[PDB]
Design a protein around this ligand. Structure first.
Ligand SMILES: CCOC(=O)c1ccc([N+](=O)[O-])s1
Ligand SMILES: [Mn+2]
Ligand SMILES: [Mn+2]
Ligand SMILES: [Zn+2]
Ligand SMILES: [Zn+2]
Length: 145
């Protein structure tokens, strides 16, 4: 394709644990990351959805990272929509998604500027690790954990 994500993590590269949370009643949310080299960022968002905050967190990781990046998301949708866009691009019977088109397009913009990207899904879980840390940061004031 016009790109292909890595099949396994990029050894040596900084890892961004991304997450977003939104509250449906208010459309308020947060998106951000923590990294294994001690970086972290959280942004507040309005007029948003959980899916958009998860994509926004990936966007921030691509914006703030170097040429090779590992990204761990707990959003099956964010992973799928991005992967399908990559694999199905400038190809035959693919039709652009309806929702979140602008944001996914901006993510794709960032992605083609990278040299290597590993994007993996994990389920949300308990513990003290990376997904847990960023979840708590974006959930504060948005949802009870
Ligand atoms: C308040 C939301 O806290 C979160 O970060 C997430 C919860 C569940 C996710 N998942 O199942 O795609 S992310
Ligand atoms: Mn999440
Ligand atoms: Mn989470
Ligand atoms: Zn608003
Ligand atoms: Zn490189």
């Amino acid at each position: 394709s016009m790109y292909q994500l890595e099949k396994e993590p990029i050894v040596g590269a900084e890892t961004f644990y991304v997450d977003g949370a939104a509250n449906r009643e208010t459309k308020l949310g947060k998106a951000g990351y923590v990294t294994n080299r001690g970086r972290q960022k959280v942004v507040t968002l309005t007029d948003t959805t959980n899916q958009k905050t998860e994509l926004q967190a990936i966007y921030l990781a691509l914006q703030d990272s170097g040429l090779e990046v590992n990204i761990v998301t707990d959003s099956q949708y964010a992973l799928g929509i991005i992967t399908q866009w990559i694999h199905n691009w400038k190809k035959r019977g693919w039709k652009t998604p309806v929702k979140n088109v602008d944001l996914v397009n901006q993510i794709i913009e960032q992605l083609i500027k990278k040299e290597k990207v590993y994007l993996a899904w994990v389920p949300a879980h308990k513990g003290i690790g990376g997904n847990e840390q960023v979840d708590k940061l974006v959930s504060a004031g948005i949802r009870k954990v």
